[PDB]
Swiss-Prot record, chain D:
Name recorded for this polypeptide: DNA-directed RNA polymerases I, II, and III subunit RPABC5
Lineage: Eukaryota, Fungi, Dikarya, Ascomycota, Saccharomycotina
Tree of life domain: Eukaryota
GO molecular function: DNA binding; DNA-directed RNA polymerase activity; zinc ion binding
Gene3D superfamilies noted in UniProt: Homeodomain-like (1.10.10.60)
Organism field: Saccharomyces cerevisiae (strain ATCC 204508 / S288c)
A GO biological-process term: transcription by RNA polymerase II
Note: Present with 5300 molecules/cell in log phase SD medium.
Location relative to the cell: Nucleus, Nucleolus
Family classification: Belongs to the archaeal Rpo10/eukaryotic RPB10 RNA polymerase subunit family.
Function: DNA-dependent RNA polymerases catalyze the transcription of DNA into RNA using the four ribonucleoside triphosphates as substrates. Common component of RNA polymerases I, II and III which synthesize ribosomal RNA precursors, mRNA precursors and many functional non-coding RNAs, and a small RNAs, such as 5S rRNA and tRNAs, respectively. Pol II is the central component of the basal RNA polymerase II transcription machinery. Pols are composed of mobile elements that move relative to each other. In Pol II, RBP10 is part of the core element with the central large cleft.
Swiss-Prot record, chain E:
Subunit structure as annotated in this protein's UniProt entry: Component of the RNA polymerase I (Pol I), RNA polymerase II (Pol II) and RNA polymerase III (Pol III) complexes. Component of the RNA polymerase I (Pol I) complex consisting of 14 subunits: RPA135, RPA190, RPC40, RPA14, RPB5, RPO26, RPA43, RPB8, RPA12, RPB10, RPC19, RPC10, RPA49 and RPA34. The complex is composed of a horseshoe-shaped core containing ten subunits (RPA135, RPA190, RPB5, RPO26, RPB8, RPB10, RPC10, RPA12, RPC19 and RPC40) where RPA135 and RPA190 form the DNA-binding cleft.
Residues where N-acetylserine is found: 1
Gene Ontology process terms (BP): nucleolar large rRNA transcription by RNA polymerase I; ribosome biogenesis; RNA-templated transcription; termination of RNA polymerase I transcription; termination of RNA polymerase III transcription; transcription by RNA polymerase I; transcription by RNA polymerase II; transcription by RNA polymerase III
Protein name according to UniProt: DNA-directed RNA polymerases I, II, and III subunit RPABC3
Gene Ontology cellular component list: nucleoplasm; nucleus; RNA polymerase I complex; RNA polymerase II, core complex; RNA polymerase III complex
SUPFAM superfamilies assigned to the protein according to its UniProt record, in alphabetical order: Nucleic acid-binding proteins (SSF50249)
From Swiss-Prot, chain F:
Protein name from the UniProt record: DNA-directed RNA polymerase II subunit RPB11
Subunit structure: Component of the RNA polymerase II (Pol II) complex consisting of 12 subunits.
Outcome when changing residue 108 to K: Transcript termination readthrough. Lethal
Organism placement in taxonomy: Eukaryota, Fungi, Dikarya, Ascomycota, Saccharomycotina
SUPFAM superfamilies: RBP11-like subunits of RNA polymerase
Effect of residue 108 to G/V: Transcript termination readthrough
Stated consequence of mutating residue 111 to P: Transcript termination readthrough
PROSITE patterns with a match to the protein in the record: RNA_POL_L_13KD
UniProt similarity note: Belongs to the archaeal Rpo11/eukaryotic RPB11/RPC19 RNA polymerase subunit family.
A single GO cellular-component term on record: nucleus
Keyword annotations from UniProtKB, A to Z: DNA-directed RNA polymerase, Nucleus, Transcription
GO biological process: RNA-templated transcription; termination of RNA polymerase II transcription; transcription by RNA polymerase II; transcription elongation by RNA polymerase II; transcription initiation at RNA polymerase II promoter
Function as written in the Swiss-Prot or TrEMBL entry: DNA-dependent RNA polymerase catalyzes the transcription of DNA into RNA using the four ribonucleoside triphosphates as substrates. Component of RNA polymerase II which synthesizes mRNA precursors and many functional non-coding RNAs. Pol II is the central component of the basal RNA polymerase II transcription machinery. It is composed of mobile elements that move relative to each other. RPB11 is part of the core element with the central large cleft. Seems to be involved transcript termination.
Swiss-Prot record, chain J:
Family to which this protein belongs: Belongs to the RNA polymerase beta chain family.
Domain of life where this protein originates: Eukaryota
Protein name (record): DNA-directed RNA polymerase II subunit RPB2
Coiled-coil stretches noted in the UniProt entry, renumbered to this chain: none
Organism in which the protein naturally occurs: Saccharomyces cerevisiae (strain ATCC 204508 / S288c)
Function as written in the Swiss-Prot or TrEMBL entry: DNA-dependent RNA polymerase catalyzes the transcription of DNA into RNA using the four ribonucleoside triphosphates as substrates. Second largest component of RNA polymerases II which synthesizes mRNA precursors and many functional non-coding RNAs. Proposed to contribute to the polymerase catalytic activity and forms the polymerase active center together with the largest subunit. Pol II is the central component of the basal RNA polymerase II transcription machinery.
Binding-site positions, Zn(2+): 183, 186
Length: 180, 160, 43, 65, 133, 114, 86, 264, 773, 196
RNA sequence: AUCGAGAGGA
């Protein structure tokens, strides 16, 4: 996203653009596409070298003014103390890869665990293609009764995980029982 | 360093003392200095002590370094094991390293040493020098597929 | 399949560990273990 | 790939509940929770069979052979 | 095969510790003001509260199995109401003419201090304990 | 590929008898019975009802390995009480309890209205 | 190299039977047993050659001799009857 | 009424019976629960001879499904175990031969329900093997779907069995089983961070037991006798005959024990 | 090194492992397919012919069976396809390759095989699934899990081979490990957590569960132990039932930091004649620790009794736990509100300390501590504060956790868990590190593009205030990623470096065998040591015991050992001897006692000259601390009757006992001086324990018990002697290679890099230093 | 394996009776050890259980994205309002006896996957069979009924025990034995031997 | 089958 002066520091995107975007997403009028955002200067393409010369906010809620009551169980995010902004991140959950986007709450585990799961999820049995019955590959393994998880990362919607899931919601009990 | 010392009563007590740690090492000149106790100095480099304080002191410094790296993890291994390793590294004049340079170039048979490094050049030089292997070592009697001189085969068995 | 389609390789001075520049362009978690850990990254 | 006959943990007949399920939220505009309760699915061991189930056969049929 | 000890203790200190089914009790003999004891008491079985008066007795009988009380033909040896069975594990001698005995009823400990059980308590595993309300 | 045929859990085979008796060693009046193709279902019930009997010194069961469908029960009794009689009487108490239960239940269900 | 023996009166090696020589002895006995050799004990109803060897050893009825070897080339000869077992 | 285990029934239906078992030892109630689950015989399919399969699924997929369909087995006792009978592979007094034949004529997807199972073997007049259909629309359980031109043709030989050999014979659904809800017996240490009262909820049956007051100490020689049960059925056997035949089955187990003792 | 030093072999098998408690220690659950495959040649004899003939007749396709039959001509007979499968009649001298059967000895091995104790014999138990089952207490010397791990099983092919396996490489003999001179196998996770909650003061057991528990222990006599409660209800203690597996005659004395004989915290541990008296059971007692229950039982009762001790504790505790239950949940990660507020107030105080230091150092008002620069003083002052805050918050959490928090109970048991785990999951995960320092500046003068440049704040260099429970922020998550990556790579590097190090070790010392003259040598005849371990003793049969003559004041030493037969109040009181008043005066004995005391003071000065640091607890062969207990309980000593010992008895008996603790046996003064030197520590210990006053006053021995002590001590000394033939080079190389694999990361090279600077003589050491006094 | 690096084999399969169960008559599909929790610090597993149970009861989808402001305390509020315990424990009864489990147990639905390693795809054993042409040794690979490598690491192992006869059997009687005739003058394998 | 390259497993 692009932050500029309107008034004061504010991102260039706005709720009307989201209106037109999701209204195009429903027709599924002059459709509002990703290219319509890019060719409108509401979004830029920053590579590794370029981000050395800009100051990026992480969430748009970093752009409200600040001047109490709070959930102590909520996480402790620091006041950002920065106002020379130029951009705001899209969403930090998008720094992840394709395989680390399946784990729920990856912000609550030890990073080695998440890497181990990243490497193991490529092993799981499931439906790899709806046309397994036509393709005669050398090794095919399909799960009889796949299920979509009850805990979903939002990014599954674009990874089609809830359309081709590869696991089951086992009823887990964490118990000591007969020592097997 | 709160060193333990006996009181005149016989009861041990911790006597605190001031100690100096260095960021460099040069033994030859530091101990030959007034004001210090040249009987208690210690260097974390054993290879300088081997040159300065004879060979047995280097042996002991090496053993202490090994015990330190084992005690770092809280582990404990028994003195006979590290002692065998150390006194092997010291059963020659100086520190016989455990690399291809060191013990490896010994005359410990010929089919023994052809199983660590320079696997071919060792056979070459042993055909050249016309080495004779005792074939008493483990690896020789293993390569021969014979019963090796091990605990079970340290002897012979005859009839009455 | 989707991971394999987005997979990199580095041939071979500390090129393995994660770097501040990897933010947003490479997964910090997704990478093989043991041999060539950190060489093969997934964007 | 298709609706299970019985739940995996209790054993109740849950197959007959599938065709109804959709039409409870697609015709009667219900909610998944109430459209599961009105079907006699109360213990979550049965609930998760109809809720998490992905009917992939609708795509398997698209193929002609 | 008969009783080895009798006395009357009034408790002084009650301490639940960290447990929930047991309490450490530090009690003192009444009008015999030199013998004092400490005891682990199952509160759920005998709810001993603070500042109580409890009669303490020690027996030596009344190997083979322990059959449960079969019938009334098995006559009990207890008008008391709380009975335990353990073993001695040390006899401490705090001062001259002041001995201490150490009993353990499978975890539940007891220490007794004084010098007037002298002829009775031995280093024998056999030691029954009896408590009257 | 090595797993048993399932029906082995409840059907005997090749001279495997249903009950085997062995007098216990280092025990006065006692026996250990090898049951065959029975599980906790019967064992714990028989043990509880045996513990209801007031002439039995000792009674307990165990499954030495869950792979196998078997369970052993040991009983030690008073004098003059061949422990098989205690087992018999406990089992008959069980059967009569179950019969009274079934009868009361049919009664109440017929009383029930649905 | 000529007659590197040691007379019995003057010997210094360990008089106990170490687990290595004992294991080799039991193994040699089990070998020759398993191939139908006679047995030197009224065997208390046992068939396994290894346990036959263990009982024979406990009964001091094995006619085998250990030639404990040294570095110099000389050696020692020890009887199973000599060698104590603990 | 009769002497011993008293039963007070609370609710009853063709689906589930919720009641109270009273004046029994615990082990008897546990054994009854286990035998109600997985020791009363029913009937379901144990062989599937397939002729033509053009479905989008595999043959053993549909087989595994077919085994799981609940079948009416009220009069199951007139049918003998296939291993017990003398027939060659299966007969009419020892098995039931359902069959199934479907074809996707319609341009629309043709479902293959349970009611499409046609019985073939002779019943000899007994309530046996009727596919249980409790749906409110008449349709059975959904087995497979068919596109245009995809036919299915198989026969099913259903034999007698119990849930130990495989769970398809499971005639009991889920047995609610609670006792001492106030936990006056101290059979469980309640985990707590503020108060064992506010965090765990009041059990449903807590109204049927007399509340304990904090003054009365603990009843140290009470043993559990009152239990609160609920049996749910799938449809092969009504809830009543489930528990009835389970009690009869446990008594039969003890009877086999006694006759083995006689043989001894 | 690919086809000669090691090669693929027949008669092998390999598959997945799994844990099954109802197997004893030295059993292996072997699948039925494997046992149908693997063969063992057996010779037909009138002991076996009736069984082997039936075995043949059973055919090769069901176990027990046989596959091949060899006659004296040598033409193999294929029972799988032949005419005479049932007609066969075996004449003698033949071989049958039977299926591997129950109680067969087979080698069980785990790659990577580092330890000598990772290739152990095992007894076959043929099970109906396709996994290798084994006991959970054997996961230590294999470093196994059941998380996909698979292992290998080799079969012997000769009777002497079966002997070598069953008498040398068997499991029960490998309980005691020469490395670390302590047992390797112990009580593991599930059994341990059970044995804790079983043994609490509070945990009481009713009747039916007690009788089942009793029956569970196989080697049980039927003596239903009397309960600890009698009147209201006959309840038992978990100790009173647990004691039934601990054999008769095992004593154990331990104290834990608060251990009055009242044990106000149930600390320590008392075990009397094989019956536990008081004290919680946890890893310090039953673990793989030094001087624990496995150690004592292995030394005293033997290997088989210890294996059955494993079996019995397991079968009891798993049963109890199975019926009592255990869970983890997240409720064990939530501390109280006020605790969490204190936690974040501590973190805020730390942040303000750091900010004060920062704005200070920005005014150049920094006393740059000597040796290090400005920025280094700042980095130290900040990292110290952040780690202090993390550990203080973690300690607050561990203070607030209740007694029933399940993670706290796995911590107390020692099964699985630590404290820093608690600090991270609930309090504060802390500050991560890459290449030693804080989160480096990847971009120009900043860590991530979301911060101003030159932001040395705690929040910018990697500090993570939010615990795992609250939730990491994006920046913090990425810094944790940077830390965990270095963790993974350091692990993968140090593993291989250790592997090559250990291969060099083994191939350096591979021929070092204790020859028959107790002189450690190699293939060339070179001598490494003239006495093995400088004391000629095995690493096993060694226990850590105290040299009691050292330490303590001089006057207390005099009170503890000095006897003045010529004094009124420094002589053996007649309460301690029949010969009390008779011995008064009698200078002919006071000379002997004076010589005793002179030798003891000589040894005191000797030890204080050797162990300068004043540590008396040191490893020695024979544990007298336990033998004295064996005596006091075996002959039923009462501390009331006088001894029947002359002082000459004690003194001359000790003095000639020393003369029999042989190590080397030679007949000459050089070997004799070697032996006299090589037992001097043990003889110092002996006199420190077998002192006349100490003997007759601290353990009132009789004559019978005394001579029994003096024979059993000789016996244990001659058994603890190292055995000629032990290949000690491989043993030592492994003893030093394995515990190195478990090392990882105040500026010195510590751990494996220090090791590789040490082994390969490194003239460019990365951190030399010169500690001078 | 779960979705948080929790690997695991199947120790044994229990029937439905033997299994523990709650008051509602619900029975676990999976029983995992508690001890594997704190040494790995997998809090996503424990939280996921809660979220999955809450969504299964309510009939919604459990948003499990990272950097979302989801408290465990709101999940606990929801599970309390749904008539369950707040932190997700549930009273369970032993299946063998029915005696209340003194320890209430963490119980809930949770996603699990089947990794591609089945034992019938891993098991292997060899007694005797095909042998390489050149090395006269057991071949490598299960697909050829291959042999297992008694590698030199395992040889270093076996040496410490003292079993020399075991090594001689493993190296010759188990594989690639060979009988060679040699001459006393020329100490090579060049002599000629017509046996018959 | 021989050689070599890959992705995986503990
Ligand atoms: Mg593993
Ligand atoms: Zn269900
Ligand atoms: Zn028939
Ligand atoms: Zn020649």
């Amino acid at each position: 996203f692009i932050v500029e002066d309107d008034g004061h520091k504010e991102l260039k995107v706005r709720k009307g653009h989201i209106a037109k975007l999701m209204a195009t997403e429903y027709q599924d009028v002059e459709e509002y596409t990703w290219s319509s955002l890019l060719n409108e200067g509401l979004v830029e393409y920053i590579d590794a070298e370029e981000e050395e010369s800009i100051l990026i906010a992480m969430q748009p809620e970093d752009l409200e003014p600040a001047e109490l009551d709070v959930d102590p169980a909520k996480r402790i995010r620091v006041s950002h103390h920065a106002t020379t902004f130029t951009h705001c991140e899209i969403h930090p959950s998008m720094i992840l890869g394709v395989a680390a986007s399946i784990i729920p709450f990856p912000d609550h585990n030890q990073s080695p665990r998440n890497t181990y799961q990243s490497a193991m999820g490529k092993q799981a049995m499931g439906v790899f293609l709806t046309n397994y019955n036509v393709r005669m590959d050398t090794m095919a393994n399909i799960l009889y009764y796949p299920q979509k998880p009850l805990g979903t990362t939002r990014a599954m919607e674009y990874l089609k995980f809830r359309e081709l899931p590869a696991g089951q919601n086992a009823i887990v009990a964490i118990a000591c029982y007969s020592g097997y | 360093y709160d060193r333990k010392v006996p009181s005149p009563t016989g009861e041990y007590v911790k006597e605190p003392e001031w100690v100096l740690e260095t960021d460099g090492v040069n033994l030859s000149e530091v101990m030959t200095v007034p004001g210090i106790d040249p009987t208690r100095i210690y260097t974390n480099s054993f290879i300088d002590i081997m040159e300065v304080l004879g060979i047995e002191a280097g042996r002991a410094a090496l053993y202490k370094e090994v015990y330190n790296v084992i005690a770092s993890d809280g582990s404990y291994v028994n003195y006979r094991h590290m002692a065998l390793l150390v006194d092997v590294m010291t059963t020659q004049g100086g520190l016989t390293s455990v690399t291809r340079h060191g013990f490896n170039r010994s005359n410990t048979g010929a089919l023994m040493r052809c199983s660590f490094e320079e696997t071919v050049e060792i056979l070459f030089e042993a055909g050249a020098s016309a080495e004779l292997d005792d074939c008493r070592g483990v690896s020789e009697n293993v390569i021969l597929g014979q019963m090796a001189p091990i605990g079970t085969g340290a002897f012979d068995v005859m009839i009455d | 399949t989707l991971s394999h389609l987005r997979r990199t390789n580095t041939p071979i001075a500390k090129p393995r560990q994660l770097h501040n520049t990897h933010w947003g362009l490479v997964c910090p978690a997704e990478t093989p273990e043991g041999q060539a850990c950190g060489l093969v990254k997934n964007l | 790939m298709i609706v299970p006959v019985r739940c995996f943990s209790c054993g109740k007949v849950v197959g007959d509940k599938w065709e109804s399920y959709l039409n409870l939220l697609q015709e009667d505009e219900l909610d998944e929770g109430t459209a599961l309760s009105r079907l006699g699915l109360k213990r979550y061991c049965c609930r998760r069979m109809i809720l998490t189930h992905v009917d992939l056969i609708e795509k398997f049929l698209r193929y002609n052979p | 095969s008969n009783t080895l000890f009798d006395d009357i203790f009034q408790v002084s200190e009650v301490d639940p510790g960290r447990y929930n089914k047991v309490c450490r009790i530090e009690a003192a003999s009444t009008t015999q003001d030199q013998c004092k004891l400490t005891l682990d008491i199952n509160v759920e079985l005998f709810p001993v509260a603070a500042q109580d008066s409890l009669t303490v007795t020690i027996a030596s009988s009344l190997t083979r199995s322990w059959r449960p009380p079969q019938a009334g033909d098995r006559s009990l040896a207890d008008d008391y109401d709380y009975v335990m069975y353990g073993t001695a594990y040390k006899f401490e001698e705090v001062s001259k003419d002041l001995i201490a005995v150490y009993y353990s009823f499978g975890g539940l400990l007891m220490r007794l201090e004084g010098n007037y059980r002298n002829l009775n308590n031995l280093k024998q595993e056999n030691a029954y304990l009896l408590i009257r309300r | 590929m090595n797993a048993p045929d399932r029906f082995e859990l409840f059907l005997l085979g090749e001279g495997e008898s249903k009950l085997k008796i062995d007098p216990d060693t280092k025990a006065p009046n006692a026996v250990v019975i090898t049951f065959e193709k029975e599980d906790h279902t019967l064992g714990n019930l028989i043990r509880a009802e045996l513990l209801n009997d007031r002439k039995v010194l000792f009674a307990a069961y165990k499954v030495e390995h869950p792979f196998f469908a078997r369970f052993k029960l040991r009983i030690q009794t008073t004098e003059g009480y061949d422990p098989k009689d205690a087992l018999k009487n406990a089992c008959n108490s069980i059967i009569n309890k179950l019969g009274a239960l079934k009868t009361n239940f049919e009664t109440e269900w017929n009383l029930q209205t649905l | 190299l000529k007659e590197k023996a040691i007379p019995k009166d003057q010997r210094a090696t360990t008089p106990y039977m170490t687990k290595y020589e004992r294991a080799r002895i039991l193994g040699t006995r089990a070998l020759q047993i398993s191939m139908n050799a006679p047995v030197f004990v009224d065997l208390e109803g046992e068939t396994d050659p290894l346990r036959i060897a263990m009982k024979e050893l406990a009964e001091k009825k094995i006619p085998l001799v250990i030639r404990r070897y040294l570095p110099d080339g000389s050696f020692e000869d020890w009887s199973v009857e000599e060698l104590i077992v603990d | 009424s009769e002497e011993g285990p008293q039963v007070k029934i609370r609710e009853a239906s063709k689906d589930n019976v919720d009641f109270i078992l009273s004046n029994v030892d615990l082990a008897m109630a546990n054994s009854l629960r286990r035998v109600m689950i997985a020791e009363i015989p029913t009937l379901a399919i144990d062989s599937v001879e397939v002729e033509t399969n053009t479905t989008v699924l595999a043959d053993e997929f549909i087989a595994h499904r077919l085994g799981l369909i609940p079948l009416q087995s009220m009069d199951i006792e007139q049918l003998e175990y296939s291993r017990d009978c003398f027939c060659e592979d299966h007969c009419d007094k020892c098995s039931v031969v359902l069959t199934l034949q479907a074809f996707g004529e319609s341009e629309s997807t043709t479902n293959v329900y349970s009611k499409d199972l046609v019985i073939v073997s002779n019943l000899m007049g007994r309530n046996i093997g009727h596919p249980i259909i409790q749906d409110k629309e008449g349709n059975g359980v959904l087995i497979c779907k068919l596109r245009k031109g995809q036919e299915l043709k198989l026969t099913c030989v259903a034999k007698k069995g119990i849930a130990k050999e495989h769970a398809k014979w499971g005639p009991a659904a889920a047995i609610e089983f609670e006792y001492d809800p106030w936990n006056k017996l101290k059979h469980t240490d309640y985990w707590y961070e503020q108060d064992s009262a506010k965090e765990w909820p009041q059990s449903k049956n807590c109204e049927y037991e007399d509340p304990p007051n904090e003054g009365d100490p603990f009843d140290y020689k009470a043993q559990a006798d009152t239990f609160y049960m609920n049996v749910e059925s799938v449809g092969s056997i009504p809830v009543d005959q489930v528990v009835v035949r389970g009690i009869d089955t446990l008594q039969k187990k003890v009877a086999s024990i006694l006759l083995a003792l006689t043989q001894m | 090194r690919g086809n000669l030093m090691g090669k693929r072999v027949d008669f092998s098998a390999r598959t997945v492992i799994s844990g099954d408690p109802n197997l004893e220690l030295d059993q292996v659950g072997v699948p039925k397919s494997i046992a149908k495959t693997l063969t063992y040649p057996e010779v037909v004899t009138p002991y076996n012919i009736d069984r082997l003939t039936q075995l043949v007749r059973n055919g090769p396709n069901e176990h027990p069976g046989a596959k091949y039959v060899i006659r004296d001509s040598g033409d193999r007979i294929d029972l799988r396809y032949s005419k005479r499968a049932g007609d066969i009649q075996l004449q003698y001298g033949w071989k049958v390759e039977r299926h591997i059967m129950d109680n067969d000895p087979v080698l069980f091995n785990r790659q990577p095989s580092l330890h000598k104790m990772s290739m152990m014999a095992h007894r076959v138990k043929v099970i109906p699934y396709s996994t290798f089952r084994l006991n959970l207490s054997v996961t230590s010397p294999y470093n196994a899990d059941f998380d996909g791990d698979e292992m290998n099983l080799h079969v012997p092919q000769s009777e002497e081979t079966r002997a070598e396996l069953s008498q040398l490489c068997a499991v029960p003999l490998q309980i005691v490990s020469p490395q670390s001179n302590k047992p390797c196998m112990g009580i593991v996770q599930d059994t341990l957590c059970g044995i804790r909650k079983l043994t609490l003061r509070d945990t009481f057991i009713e009747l039916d569960q007690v009788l089942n528990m009793l029956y569970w222990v196989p080697d049980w006599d039927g003596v239903i132990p009397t309960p600890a409660i009698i009147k209201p209800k006959p309840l038992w203690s978990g100790k009173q039932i647990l004691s039934v597996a601990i054999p008769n005659g095992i004593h154990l004395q331990r104290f834990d930091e608060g251990t009055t004989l009242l044990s106000p915290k149930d600390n320590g541990m008392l075990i009397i004649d094989g019956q536990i008296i008081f004290g919680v059971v946890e890893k310090k007692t039953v673990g793989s620790s030094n001087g624990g229950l496995i150690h004592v039982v292995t030394r005293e009762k033997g290997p088989q009794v210890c294996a059955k001790l494993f079996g019995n504790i397991q079968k009891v505790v798993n049963f109890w736990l199975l019926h009592n239950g255990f869970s983890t949940g997240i409720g064990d990660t939530i501390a109280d509100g006020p605790t969490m507020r204190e936690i974040t107030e501590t973190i805020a105080e730390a942040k303000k300390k750091v900010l004060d230091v920062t704005k200070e150092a920005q005014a150049n008002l920094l006393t740059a501590k000597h040796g290090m620069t400005l920025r280094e003083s700042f980095e130290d002052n900040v990292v110290r504060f952040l780690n202090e805050a993390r550990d203080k918050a973690g300690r607050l959490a561990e203070v607030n956790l209740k007694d029933l928090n399940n993670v706290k109970q796995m911590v107390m048991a020692g099964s699985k868990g630590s404290f820093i785990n608690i600090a991270q999951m609930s309090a504060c995960v802390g500050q991560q590190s890459v290449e030693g320092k804080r989160i480096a500046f990847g971009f120009v003068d900043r860590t991530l593009p979301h911060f101003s440049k030159d932001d040395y704040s705690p929040e910018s260099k990697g500090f993570v205030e939010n615990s795992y429970l609250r939730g990491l922020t994006p920046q913090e998550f990425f810094f944790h990623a940077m830390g965990g990556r270095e963790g993974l790579i350091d692990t993968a590097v140090k593993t291989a470096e250790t592997g090559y190090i250990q291969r060099r070790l083994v191939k350096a010392l591979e021929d070092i065998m204790v020859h028959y003259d107790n002189t450690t040598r190699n293939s060339l005849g070179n001598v490494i040591q003239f006495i093995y371990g400088e004391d000629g003793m095995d690493a096993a049969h060694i226990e850590k015991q105290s040299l009691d003559t050292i330490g303590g004041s001089d006057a207390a030493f005099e009170k503890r050992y000095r006897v003045d037969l010529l004094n009124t109040d420094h002589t053996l009181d007649p309460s301690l001897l029949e010969s009390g008043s008779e011995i008064l005066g009698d200078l002919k004995l006071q000379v002997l006692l004076d010589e005793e005391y002179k030798q003891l003071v000589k040894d005191r000065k000797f030890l204080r000259e050797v162990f300068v640091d004043g540590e008396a607890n040191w490893p020695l062969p024979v544990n007298i601390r336990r033998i004295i207990q064996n005596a006091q309980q075996t002959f039923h000593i009462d501390h009331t009757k006088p001894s029947d010992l002359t002082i000459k008895d004690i003194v001359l008996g000790v003095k000639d006992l020393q003369e029999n603790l042989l190590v080397l046996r030679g007949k000459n003064e050089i070997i004799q001086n070697a032996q006299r030197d090589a037992v001097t520590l043990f003889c110092c210990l002996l006199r420190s324990r077998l002192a006349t006053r100490r003997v007759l006053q601290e353990y009132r021995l009789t004559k019978q018990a005394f001579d029994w002590v003096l024979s059993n001590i000789e016996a244990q000394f001659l058994r603890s002697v190292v055995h000629p033939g032990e290949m000690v080079g491989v043993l030592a190389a492994q003893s030093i290679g394995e515990p190195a694999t478990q090392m990882t990361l105040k500026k010195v090279t510590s751990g494996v890099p220090r090791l590789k600077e040490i082994l390969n003589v490194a003239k460019n050491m990365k951190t030399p230093s010169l500690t001078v006094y | 394996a779960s979705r948080h690096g929790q690997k695991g084999t199947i120790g044994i399969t229990y029937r439905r009776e033997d299994m523990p169960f709650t008051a509602e008559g619900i029975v676990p599909d999976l029983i995992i050890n508690p001890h594997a929790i704190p040494s790995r610090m997998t809090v996503a597993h424990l939280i996921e259980c809660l979220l999955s149970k809450v969504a299964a009861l309510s009939g919604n989808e459990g948003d499990a994205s990272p950097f979302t402001d989801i408290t465990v305390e709101g999940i606990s509020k929801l599970l309390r309002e749904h008539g369950y315990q707040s932190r997700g424990f549930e009273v369970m009864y032993n299946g063998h006896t029915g005696k209340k489990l003194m320890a209430q147990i963490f119980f809930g639905p949770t996603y699990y996957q089947r990794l591609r390693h089945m034992v019938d795809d891993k098991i292997h054993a060899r007694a005797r069979g095909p042998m390489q042409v050149l090395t006269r040794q057991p071949v490598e690979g299960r697909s050829r009924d291959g042999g297992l490598r008694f590698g030199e690491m395992e040889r270093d192992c076996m040496i410490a025990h003292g079993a020399a006869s075991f090594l001689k059997e493993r190296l010759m009687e188990a594989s690639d034995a060979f009988r060679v005739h040699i001459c006393g003058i020329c100490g090579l394998m060049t002599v000629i031997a017509k046996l018959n």
